[PDB]
Design an enzyme around this catalytic site. Structure first.
Site, short mmCIF file in Angstrom:
data_model
loop_
_atom_site.label_atom_id
_atom_site.label_comp_id
_atom_site.label_asym_id
_atom_site.label_seq_id
_atom_site.Cartn_x
_atom_site.Cartn_y
_atom_site.Cartn_z
N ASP A 180 0.82 -1.16 -0.12
CA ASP A 180 0.02 -0.08 -0.08
C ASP A 180 0.90 1.20 0.03
O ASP A 180 1.75 1.30 0.54
CB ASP A 180 -0.99 0.01 1.20
CG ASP A 180 -1.89 1.01 1.12
OD1 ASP A 180 -2.20 1.48 0.20
OD2 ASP A 180 -2.67 1.49 2.16
N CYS A 214 -8.23 -2.32 -5.04
CA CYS A 214 -6.96 -2.43 -4.11
C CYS A 214 -7.94 -2.33 -2.62
O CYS A 214 -8.88 -2.83 -2.33
CB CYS A 214 -6.10 -1.39 -4.25
SG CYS A 214 -6.51 0.41 -4.68
N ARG A 220 -3.07 2.14 -6.15
CA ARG A 220 -2.86 1.05 -6.63
C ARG A 220 -3.53 0.49 -7.84
O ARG A 220 -3.01 0.42 -9.02
CB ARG A 220 -2.63 -0.18 -5.95
CG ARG A 220 -1.60 -0.22 -4.92
CD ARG A 220 -1.37 -1.15 -3.63
NE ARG A 220 -2.59 -0.94 -2.68
CZ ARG A 220 -2.76 -1.64 -1.54
NH1 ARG A 220 -2.03 -2.59 -1.64
NH2 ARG A 220 -3.72 -1.24 -0.68
N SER A 221 -5.00 0.86 -7.62
CA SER A 221 -5.87 0.78 -8.78
C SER A 221 -5.52 1.73 -10.01
O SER A 221 -5.61 1.36 -11.16
CB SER A 221 -7.38 0.53 -8.41
OG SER A 221 -7.62 -0.33 -7.55
N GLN A 261 -1.63 7.66 -5.99
CA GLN A 261 -1.58 8.09 -4.67
C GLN A 261 -0.46 8.83 -4.18
O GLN A 261 -0.26 9.67 -2.94
CB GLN A 261 -2.14 7.26 -3.44
CG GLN A 261 -3.65 7.11 -3.28
CD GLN A 261 -4.30 8.16 -2.60
OE1 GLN A 261 -4.08 8.51 -1.59
NE2 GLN A 261 -5.03 9.24 -3.33
#
Ligand SMILES: CNC(=O)[C@@H]1Cc2ccc(NS(=O)(=O)O)cc2CN1C(=O)OCc1ccccc1
Ligand SMILES: [Cl-]
Ligand SMILES: [Cl-]
Ligand SMILES: [Cl-]
Ligand SMILES: [Cl-]
Ligand SMILES: [Cl-]
Ligand SMILES: [Mg+2]
Length: 297
Positions: A180, A214, A220-221, A261
């Site tokens: 993450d 995710c 991550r997506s 992110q």
């Protein structure tokens, strides 16, 4: 052009600034449905919500809300559904969405437990003989087989509408080593996995949009979908120079907030697309190289 820009950003040390510019320019649309009191327990995170305009509506049938967004890439002619990791009470909704949207594939980029916390429900069966029944949404879900690799697992699932007894094969692609707020181990490991999803036919325009998730369904997506769309756009044109990665990311952000992110995830996206372009533009041999470098066995 992306490789020349990459080098310039690297040389000037400006990934943080480039990334902040994207954050500044990104769309802000209402999420009124997401924020209704009745929907509080349908959201994993206070501050991560689907925009009203692009939210996926469930077809049943009392409350239509799921934290999931349709990313409809018009120029690329590919769509994805990005969603949070389902909660203990939204697993039936999740599979209802897969059924109604006619998705063939689900791409999972997180683990159930990360950093000591439960970031996603165990929403699929781990054993063939222990199927799952979602009584709320009248669906049954059975594990048919799995192929376990060192850093990812592919599962074949059978989803059945109990109302009609119609069944569908769903393919589940689980990337297990993407931390993450972090990046894949290499461009090769990421691209080997992306091409596994591609090879399955799950991204075919004859199917509904692939579901990608995710934990929040944004970091991550977003990274996964940005690299895929960029590669597709250059493939359609056979023209790597035609692709403006930052523009593509901003376009995706019209459909769900916060995609990609960190600045390093942005940097990784450029690396993945620059590397993948070798394959798109006809060096077939690179695919085997990625497989070897990924140490999937
Ligand atoms: C440090 N941030 C957080 O812990 C929470 C939960 C979470 C888990 C996991 C996560 N990573 S992901 O699973 O790859 O999406 C992102 C977020 C975003 N988030 C937010 O609060 O995001 C709000 C946000 C930020 C930027 C843009 C839109 C919305
Ligand atoms: Cl897991
Ligand atoms: Cl842990
Ligand atoms: Cl959970
Ligand atoms: Cl992690
Ligand atoms: Cl953001
Ligand atoms: Mg067994």
């Amino acid at each position: 052009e992306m490789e020349k820009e990459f080098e310039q950003i690297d040389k000037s040390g400006s990934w943080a600034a480039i990334y902040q510019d994207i954050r500044h320019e990104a769309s802000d649309f209402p999420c009124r449905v997401a924020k209704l009191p009745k929907n509080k327990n349908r959201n994993r995170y206070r501050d991560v919500s689907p925009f009203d305009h692009s939210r996926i509506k469930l077809h049943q049938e009392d409350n239509d809300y799921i934290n999931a967004s349709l990313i409809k890439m018009e120029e690329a002619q590919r769509s994805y559904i990005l969603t949070q990791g389902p909660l203990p009470n939204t697993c039936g909704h999740f599979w209802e969405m897969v059924w109604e949207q006619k998705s063939r594939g689900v791409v999972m980029l997180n683990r159930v437990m990360e950093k000591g916390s439960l970031k996603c429900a165990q929403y699929w069966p781990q054993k063939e003989e222990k199927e799952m029944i979602f009584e709320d949404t009248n669906l049954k879900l059975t594990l048919i087989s799995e192929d376990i690799k060192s850093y990812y697992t592919v599962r074949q699932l059978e989803l059945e509408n109990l109302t009609t007894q119609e069944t569908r094969e769903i393919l589940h692609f689980h990337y297990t080593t993407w931390p993450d707020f972090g990046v894949p181990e290499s461009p090769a490991s990421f691209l080997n996995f992306l091409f596994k999803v591609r090879e399955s036919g799950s991204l075919s325009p004859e199917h509904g949009p692939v579901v990608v998730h995710c934990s929040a369904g944004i970091g991550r997506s977003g990274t996964f979908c940005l690299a895929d769309t960029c590669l597709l756009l250059m493939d359609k044109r056979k023209d790597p120079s035609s692709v403006d990665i930052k523009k593509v990311l901003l376009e995706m952000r019209k459909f769900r907030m916060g995609l990609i992110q960190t600045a390093d995830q942005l940097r990784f996206s450029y690396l993945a697309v620059i590397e993948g372009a070798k394959f798109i533009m006809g060096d077939s041999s690179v695919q085997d190289q990625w497989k070897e470098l990924s140490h999937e066995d």
